[PDB]
Design a protein around this ligand. Structure first.
Ligand SMILES: [Mg+2]
Ligand SMILES: [Mg+2]
Lengths: 150, 184, 81, 129, 97
RNA sequence: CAACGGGGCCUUUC
C-alpha cells in the first residue's frame, strides 16, 4: 500500500457484520437525514458529517440507518459540492504546499511532496472524469487551484 | 375481512387468518391503527417433520417494517388461534432471471431481484426477531452444500423451538439445505 | 499442531487477535450512554470519539478525543450500550 | 496487488499440504476458487471446505487429506484447443493415468477428462495431482 | 477557520465586495461586519473604521492583502474590503474576537 | 441394469 510511500500500514475501520441498525438505536432515519442536511448546510463535508453523527449521536453508519450514503443524501438534497471532497482536500493541500514553496523556494522536500500531491490530484481527477463526476474538460491548473478550492 | 386483507383470489385457508386479524384488531383499541393497513397475500402451508405445519404469510414488501414492529405480538396469537402451527412472515420478492448473452435487453435487473439476495432476505424474514450473526457454507465431500446460519443469542427464545420448521420452510422455498446454530 | 479448528477458534484467541485478523472482522469499539448533569437525554458517545462531544441540552464537555479511546471529563456516569 | 485470488488460494493450499497441515485458510474465496476446490474435492485431493461469509469477499477453510502433491494455477489462462489439451497434460501432469489439468470452459470449470468427454475446450485454469 | 467562515458566507449569506458598496451598506446600517485587507491604505482603513464606529458595525482585519481577501471570498479579482449583510447559516458574526 | 454424456418441463424463471 501507500501509493506514494513505502509504508505498509493496515489501520482502517472494521465495519460490523450486522447490516441493520443496532437494537438500541431509537432515532428515526428521517431524523438522521434531517440532521445530515443541517450539518451540510452548516458546511460540513460527508466525512465530517459522519464523524459528528457517530460521535455525538448513536448513528453508527448513515448507510445502515438511512439506507443511503451521506454523499448520496447530500446530492439528493441538492448540497453536493462542486468537486468531490477528497479531490478538494488534495487540491487544498497542494495550494498550501505551493504557497509555502513560493515563500521558501529552497524546500526541495516540499518540491518533491508537491509533485507527489499533484500526481495524486491528477490520478483522482482522471478517475472522476472517467466516471463523469467531473466535466471531461476539467483540469487541475496550479495557477487557479486556490480559485477552484474557493 | 376477505376483501381488505385477501388481496388475491379467495382461498379457503385465508379465511381463518383474515378473521383472526379482524377480531384481534376489534379487541384492541390501543392496536386498532396498526392492523388496519396490514394486509397480505396467499399463505403457504409447509409440512414439518415434527407433525406440525408452518404458515408462511406473504407480504410483497410494503410496510414490512410495520409487520416487523407488530410481529412479535400477533405471531403468538396466530399460533394460539389454532395449534400445531408455526407462523412466519415473509416478503414476496420478485426474482428476475439472470439475462442470457443472446437474451433481449431489459433494464438492469436490480441487485435486490437476484436469486442470492432474495434468498438471504428470505432467511432474514424467516428468523426475523433474531439477527443473523454469521453464515457458513459446508461443501460436503459428497458434493452438496449445507448453509449454516448463526443466530444472535438475544431474543432467540421466540424462534428457537421452530428451527426445524424454518429448515423445512427454507428447503421448500429454495431447495437448499439450511442448519441453524446459536453461538454460545 | 498440524491439526486445529480454524473454523472454531477459542474466544480467548479471537479476542487476542487483531480486529481485522479475526475469522470475521468486526469493530472492537462501542457506544456509551453518558448521563448529563442535566436531564431530557442520556447522550450517546462513540468509544473512540474524535469530537469533544457536548451535551444536547447543556454546554459541558463529555469526552475529549485522544489517540484511541476518548476520555470522559472525570465526572460522568456511563453505561455501555 | 492481488492479481489472482485463485493463485493465492492454491499457493496457500500447497504450502499447508507440504508443511503437513490438515487444514488451510484462504482469502478472499472467489467463485472460481470454489469451483476449483469442488473439482479437487470431487477427485479426492481435498476433503470438506467451508465458506465463511463475512460481508467482504469471504473466506474458505479447506480440510486436506494428505493426498495432494501439488495444485497450481496456470497464469495466464491460455486459450487451449481440443488438440492442445494433450500437450498441456503432457507438460503439467506426472503420468497419463492420474492428475488433472483444470480448464474453464463455456460448459463450466472441469478437469481435462470431463472436458474431453464432453468435447469442450476453453482456457486453462490450473492443475492438480 | 476565518477563511472557512467567509466561504460559508459567500455560499449562503449576503455580502458586498468593495469600498464603495461597503460604505453604502455601512451608511444604510445593513452591515453586520466589515473585513478589511491588511494592505488597505491607512486613510481608507481609518475612514471605514469611523463609518463602523458610527454604525456600530464590527470590523475584522484580514491578515492578507486584497489578493488574499479576494481569494478567501472566492473571486478572481482583488477585494480590499468585504461587507457582510446577512450571515446566512454561518457562524462568522458570533464566533469572532 | 451401471457409468458416461444430450434435450424438454415446472420449481417466483420460458
Ligand atoms: Mg497491505
Ligand atoms: Mg507506484
Amino acid at each position: 500500500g501507500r501509493m506514494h510511500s513505502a509504508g505498509k500500514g493496515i489501520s482502517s475501520s472494521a465495519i460490523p457484520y450486522s447490516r441493520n441498525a443496532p437494537a438500541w438505536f431509537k432515532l428515526s432515519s428521517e431524523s438522521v437525514i434531517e440532521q445530515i442536511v443541517k450539518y451540510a448546510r452548516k458546511g460540513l463535508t460527508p466525512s465530517q458529517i459522519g464523524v459528528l453523527l457517530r460521535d455525538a449521536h448513536g448513528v453508527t453508519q448513515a448507510r445502515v440507518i438511512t439506507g443511503n450514503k451521506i454523499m448520496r443524501i447530500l446530492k439528493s438534497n441538492g448540497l453536493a459540492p462542486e468537486i468531490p471532497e477528497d479531490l478538494y482536500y488534495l487540491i487544498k493541500k497542494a495550494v498550501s504546499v505551493r504557497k509555502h514553496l513560493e515563500r521558501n523556494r529552497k524546500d526541495k522536500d516540499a518540491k518533491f511532496r508537491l509533485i507527489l500531491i499533484e500526481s495524486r490530484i491528477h490520478r483522482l481527477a482522471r478517475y472522476y472524469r472517467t466516471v463523469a463526476v467531473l466535466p471531461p474538460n476539467w483540469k487541475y491548473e496550479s495557477a487557479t487551484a486556490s480559485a477552484l478550492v474557493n | 375481512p376477505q376483501a381488505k386483507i385477501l388481496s388475491q383470489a379467495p382461498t379457503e385457508l385465508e379465511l381463518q387468518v383474515a378473521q383472526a386479524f379482524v377480531e384481534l384488531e376489534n379487541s384492541s383499541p390501543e392496536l386498532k391503527a396498526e392492523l388496519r393497513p396490514l394486509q397480505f397475500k396467499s399463505i403457504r402451508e409447509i409440512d414439518v417433520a415434527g407433525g406440525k405445519k408452518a404458515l408462511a404469510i406473504f407480504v410483497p414488501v410494503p410496510s414490512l417494517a410495520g409487520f416487523h414492529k407488530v410481529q412479535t405480538k400477533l405471531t403468538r396469537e396466530l399460533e394460539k388461534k389454532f395449534q400445531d402451527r408455526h407462523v412466519i412472515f415473509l416478503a414476496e420478492r420478485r426474482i428476475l432471471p439472470k439475462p442470457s448473452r443472446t437474451s433481449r435487453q431489459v433494464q438492469k435487473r436490480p441487485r435486490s431481484r437476484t436469486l442470492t439476495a432474495v434468498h438471504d432476505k428470505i432467511l432474514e424474514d424467516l428468523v426475523f426477531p433474531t439477527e443473523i450473526v454469521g453464515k457458513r457454507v459446508r461443501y460436503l465431500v459428497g458434493g452438496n452444500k449445507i448453509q449454516k446460519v448463526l443466530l444472535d443469542s438475544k431474543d432467540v427464545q421466540q424462534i428457537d423451538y421452530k428451527l426445524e420448521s424454518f429448515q423445512a420452510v427454507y428447503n421448500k422455498l429454495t431447495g437448499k439445505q439450511i442448519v441453524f446454530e446459536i453461538p454460545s | 499442531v498440524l491439526v486445529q479448528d480454524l473454523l472454531h477458534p477459542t474466544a480467548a484467541s479471537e479476542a487476542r487477535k487483531h480486529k481485522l485478523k479475526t475469522l470475521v472482522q468486526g469493530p472492537r469499539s462501542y457506544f456509551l450512554d453518558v448521563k448529563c448533569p442535566g436531564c431530557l437525554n442520556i447522550t450517546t458517545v462513540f468509544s473512540h470519539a474524535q469530537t469533544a462531544v457536548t451535551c444536547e441540552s447543556c454546554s459541558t464537555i463529555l469526552c475529549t478525543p485522544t489517540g484511541g479511546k476518548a476520555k470522559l471529563s472525570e465526572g460522568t456516569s456511563f453505561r455501555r450500550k | 496487488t492481488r492479481s489472482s485470488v485463485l493463485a493465492d488460494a492454491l499457493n496457500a493450499i500447497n504450502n499447508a499440504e507440504k508443511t503437513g497441515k490438515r487444514q488451510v485458510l484462504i482469502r478472499p474465496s472467489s467463485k472460481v476458487i470454489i469451483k476449483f476446490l469442488q473439482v479437487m474435492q470431487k477427485h479426492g485431493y481435498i476433503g470438506e471446505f467451508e465458506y465463511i461469509d463475512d460481508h467482504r469477499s469471504g473466506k474458505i477453510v479447506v480440510q486436506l487429506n494428505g493426498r495432494l502433491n501439488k495444485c497450481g494455477v496456470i497464469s495466464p489462462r491460455f486459450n487451449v484447443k481440443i488438440g492442445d489439451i494433450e500437450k498441456w497434460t503432457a507438460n503439467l501432469l506426472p503420468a497419463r493415468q492420474f492428475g488433472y489439468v483444470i480448464l474453464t470452459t463455456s460448459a463450466g470449470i472441469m478437469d481435462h477428462e470431463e472436458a474431453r468427454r464432453k468435447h469442450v475446450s476453453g482456457k486453462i485454469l490450473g492443475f492438480v495431482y | 477557520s476565518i477563511n472557512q467562515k467567509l466561504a460559508l458566507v459567500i455560499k449562503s449569506g449576503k455580502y458586498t465586495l468593495g469600498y464603495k458598496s461597503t460604505v453604502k451598506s455601512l451608511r444604510q446600517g445593513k452591515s453586520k461586519l466589515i473585513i478589511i485587507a491588511a494592505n488597505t491604505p491607512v486613510l481608507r482603513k481609518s475612514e471605514l473604521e469611523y463609518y463602523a464606529m458610527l454604525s456600530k458595525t464590527k470590523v475584522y482585519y484580514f491578515q492578507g492583502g486584497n489578493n488574499e481577501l479576494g481569494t478567501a471570498v472566492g473571486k478572481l479579482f482583488r477585494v480590499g474590503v468585504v461587507s457582510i449583510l446577512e450571515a446566512g447559516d454561518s457562524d462568522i458574526l458570533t464566533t469572532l474576537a
